[PDB]
Symmetry: D2
Subunit: 284 residues, 4 copies
Amino acid sequence: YNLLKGKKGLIFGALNEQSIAWKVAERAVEEGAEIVLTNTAVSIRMGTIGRLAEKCNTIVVPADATSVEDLENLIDKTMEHFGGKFDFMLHSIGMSPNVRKGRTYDDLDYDYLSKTLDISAISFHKAIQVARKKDAINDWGSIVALSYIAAQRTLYGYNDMADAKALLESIARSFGYIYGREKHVRINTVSQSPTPTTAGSGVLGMGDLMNFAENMSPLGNASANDCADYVLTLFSDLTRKVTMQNLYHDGGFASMGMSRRAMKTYEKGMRFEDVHQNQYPFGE
Amino acid sequence: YNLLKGKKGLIFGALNEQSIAWKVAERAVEEGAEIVLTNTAVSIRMGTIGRLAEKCNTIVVPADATSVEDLENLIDKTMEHFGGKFDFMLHSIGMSPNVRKGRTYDDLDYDYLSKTLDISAISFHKAIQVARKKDAINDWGSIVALSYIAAQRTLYGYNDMADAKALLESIARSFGYIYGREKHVRINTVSQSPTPTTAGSGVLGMGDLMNFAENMSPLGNASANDCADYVLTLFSDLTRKVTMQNLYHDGGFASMGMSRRAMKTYEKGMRFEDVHQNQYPFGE
Amino acid sequence: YNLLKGKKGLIFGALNEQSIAWKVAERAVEEGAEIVLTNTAVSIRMGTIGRLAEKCNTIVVPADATSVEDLENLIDKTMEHFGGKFDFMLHSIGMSPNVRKGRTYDDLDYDYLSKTLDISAISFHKAIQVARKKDAINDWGSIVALSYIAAQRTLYGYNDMADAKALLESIARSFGYIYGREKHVRINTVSQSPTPTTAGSGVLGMGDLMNFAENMSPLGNASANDCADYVLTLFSDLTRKVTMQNLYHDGGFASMGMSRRAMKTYEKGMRFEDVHQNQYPFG
Amino acid sequence: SGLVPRGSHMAYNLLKGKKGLIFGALNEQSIAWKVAERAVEEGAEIVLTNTAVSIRMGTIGRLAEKCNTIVVPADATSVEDLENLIDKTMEHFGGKFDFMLHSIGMSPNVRKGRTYDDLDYDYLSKTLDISAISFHKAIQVARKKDAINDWGSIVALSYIAAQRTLYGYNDMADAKALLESIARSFGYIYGREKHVRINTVSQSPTPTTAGSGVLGMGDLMNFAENMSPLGNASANDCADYVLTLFSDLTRKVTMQNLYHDGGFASMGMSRRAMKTYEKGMRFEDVHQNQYPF
Ligand SMILES: NC(=O)C1=CN([C@@H]2O[C@H](COP(=O)(O)OP(=O)(O)OC[C@H]3O[C@@H](n4cnc5c(N)ncnc54)[C@H](O)[C@@H]3O)[C@@H](O)[C@H]2O)C=CC1
Ligand SMILES: NC(=O)C1=CN([C@@H]2O[C@H](COP(=O)(O)OP(=O)(O)OC[C@H]3O[C@@H](n4cnc5c(N)ncnc54)[C@H](O)[C@@H]3O)[C@@H](O)[C@H]2O)C=CC1
Ligand SMILES: NC(=O)C1=CN([C@@H]2O[C@H](COP(=O)(O)OP(=O)(O)OC[C@H]3O[C@@H](n4cnc5c(N)ncnc54)[C@H](O)[C@@H]3O)[C@@H](O)[C@H]2O)C=CC1
Ligand SMILES: NC(=O)C1=CN([C@@H]2O[C@H](COP(=O)(O)OP(=O)(O)OC[C@H]3O[C@@H](n4cnc5c(N)ncnc54)[C@H](O)[C@@H]3O)[C@@H](O)[C@H]2O)C=CC1
Ligand SMILES: [Cl-]
């Protein structure tokens, strides 16, 4: 569509070809954008962002998004790369040392929790505050962070990441009010389906949680590729009046109370009794 | 507790001893309130409200809550009975001819739908408008309607009643703004668990829907007795600053994304892996 | 962008060049869609939709969206025009006889309220039910209705239309579950800024309400043209996994509790004390 | 006009036989002070707690005397202090108790006049710890010691900045969003196990020590007042609402964020909030009572 022709952007969090940020990167460049990539020194070494950088004809700047100093260096190197200001920024970063080290929500380590909140939420505030201090972002620019419905409605096992996502979504509102009134920069969260990614694979019983979400979601779970398509609309000029929103991209999960497929009495091929026609939507 | 000592109220919708309004009536009188009861002529003949009125030492005034003329007579008869104004009013009325006659949501009769919205929602506006025109309600009075989470999140089978509840909840906001600023009268909805009542029994697959909600709700489903206890707090002086709220009374259902019990892989006695202690909350 | 190349759509409610539906129609055809237009016989005679049909190289099918018979005819004529099924549908319809006749929320006529709810909300269920019975909509198709935040939070004067919008948004969820699981058709509401349209000009003190929302919204109110741009995304393949959503398109109004500009004590030129830099965002 | 009528004593014995732990009573203006007084009038036994510094600078000693109980010093960010607090509370009651009020909030960023676009991130860490994580710390310690009876009730105080942005409210808005999530996360666990309910009360802007620290609090309270059809809720009003949540009557209410704000949370635009409105202007949205004030 050439949706982002002439646009420049900074993308965090592309680890491997499964990463939501990897798909956003590829699609942004396919749609005419120029991008800069960033990840931690460890993720650069252990994943395949080098191949993405090659495909997108750009550079990878190492940064820890919890380090104001690293973020300052990143914005300088990004603005140097572009020869000035850029239009869009994707925060696609999440990690809990509690989840990683198998600490349960009722037995948290509070030093771990501090890192969960810093990596998964405060990093967004740190990126925006540094970018804004350096005036890195053009008027009518677009900032997105990826979030999850555990921020609003509890999911068994999701642990301290649920609370981190509630904090992340609040920062989008808090900083969105400031950046919008000044420079018409919109800031939104995209609340994505459970998705098969490195960070996703660390969620307790993720395969079973994904099946639950699939059964609840009338359109089924959104893929990482689907998410990239949606994020492209938020980077495009067509969403210039959308700000401070938490935007569910989940095939309807957020709006569902009880699907037929989620019921324990349901088996595939049972007749749907809530409709007069198409009573076998998943076949006989 | 004598929570409603000196208070006078009008209770709609007591059909039989299963009715949420029946429990609210019993409990209101136990807590020192004087009440007036109303139902349709047909429901008075077909149900047991006569026995409740005997227990509560009061009158039953026949009224169709879709009839402004019946509501005018009801308010006159209520104020005559009390010798003037009263403090609280319970709307506990719901019916869909589409649900009763097995019309599905994709095959509605639109005359039936008009009646669903009239009985289940517009009757609330009619009751408040007629009461307020006759200045029937004391300053710092309390008006409650009973609603259901389908108003926000879709449940398989719930049909046109979901849309009616969304409409009912909006009327509580719209009229609450007016009655609050004028006479400090609070207007709220209580969003109750799925409950075994005459109206509840008409819901598609209600037993299985109740089972789903019970698995999703950490405290379990609320009974009609539990709901009456909660409604008593809204009629009491202790909630005088709570208005235009939709209050979930549901053992946590509204705030749950996915419980362990709701998962198809779960069986009774399986160890919970989201906690360090009490891993068998439902026994081994 | 060619965002809607090869797509076909039915657009309700284009009255005149200020209508949100008029802007959606222009922008849909600019983006490569083919459309069919509809409005009431009265609106076709009193408005300028004929001019839009000419610019969009298409037909105007008369229909009362409260009439199942008229919707059945409309969907037949639309499918005949396209030679089969279509991809998107815009519901852009609202009217309150209570508001029009100066009846206040505390003194409703209940026959007028029944018409408000029919025109403003039930018409959306009627359109979807008829279309679905005729299998009118392609898999991965997109249905949008225009709504307003009065559905969630009370605005002085907005009257029975607030209640109608809550009902409208519920229909999107109820029907969205069914059409989604069957044919992957998404159904969403766009909750738009107060906008200077014919319907908008009927709102009690619309000018003052629009100024309140402008001051509360950090990006400012969304225009009808801005709204048309957003609706384009929902008809595009890029939003295929977005359904049963009420989507605030309002420059941030829905997420604001209190802006500096909303405060009685604020005057244009006062220093913003909540930031370290850009303390004069409005000069 | 919005001042709720009081005078005659309300004695409902709502909390007769119940035992509670109350955080955050600094002085007679504190919401937690009102909750403590009202809980004892309704028949409860309480234990009080605050920081060493707050105990020394404030008047909690007076409250402790009125409520015939002890003040246990504790920094609610310290797991060790909370472990001590829960042991001293259970020793005082001779076992488990029924309710706990978290009424704690402070931002070093707000106190030091650091703005949201120029946060100190060590200060932010402390805002989040004091204002939100402390609630997790208190529930985790209490639950590990099985301190709370079946059908018990835990409440924390929050503010609508958690959902809708208010000019100047700063990093406390984000802290309140985190606090309300902890209520849901821990409510699921404590509910399913022992039917212990956990809720937040989202209160009006209130003239307290912590409240007076909010940038232009006077002007924010006036905006909320004009936007709230019943007017702002007082600390006394909030205490009355919290009593219902500690009472048996709310046993099926959990993981809720409960707005106690005279309707502020459900309002889009009040007539009073509009710049064109002056006292005594006719309301045109109604046919009757067009001069409601
Ligand atoms: N996979 C899922 O189910 C869902 C994921 N999300 C969110 O999407 C975002 C991206 O994650 P995914 O693509 O799923 O997984 P991923 O594992 O591909 O990406 C996570 C990224 O976070 C980066 N990261 C970790 N710590 C960092 C630090 N200190 N500084 C900078 N970067 C750091 C990692 O290097 C990695 O590139 C996360 O916020 C995640 O929570 C949201 C909803 C669902
Ligand atoms: N049972 C459930 O699962 C739930 C019920 N509710 C609501 O609680 C309210 C009370 O219903 P329940 O006690 O469950 O059932 P119920 O069958 O005991 O009460 C329904 C009442 O509505 C009355 N009614 C019907 N048409 C009427 C008319 N035209 N005018 C006046 N009254 C009329 C009936 O006579 C009956 O007394 C209803 O609004 C229902 O939707 C809310 C949440 C869940
Ligand atoms: N103007 C505003 O401030 C806002 C408007 N909206 C909504 O946008 C939609 C379109 O209205 P606007 O473009 O603002 O005004 P408009 O006056 O340009 O369009 C309203 C349309 O509804 C049509 N209509 C009325 N009765 C009808 C019937 N029985 N059948 C079929 N069509 C009928 C009219 O003919 C007209 O074309 C409405 O739902 C409105 O409530 C939503 C948010 C804000
Ligand atoms: N006043 C207002 O406008 C509103 C206040 N709230 C909340 O109500 C709660 C109570 O505050 P208020 O009664 O308004 O003010 P307050 O100043 O009377 O109470 C705040 C309390 O927090 C305590 N505290 C501070 N740091 C602590 C620590 N490390 N450990 C233990 N305690 C500590 C203070 O000693 C004090 O007792 C707070 O969570 C506040 O944010 C909620 C909504 C509105
Ligand atoms: Cl399903």
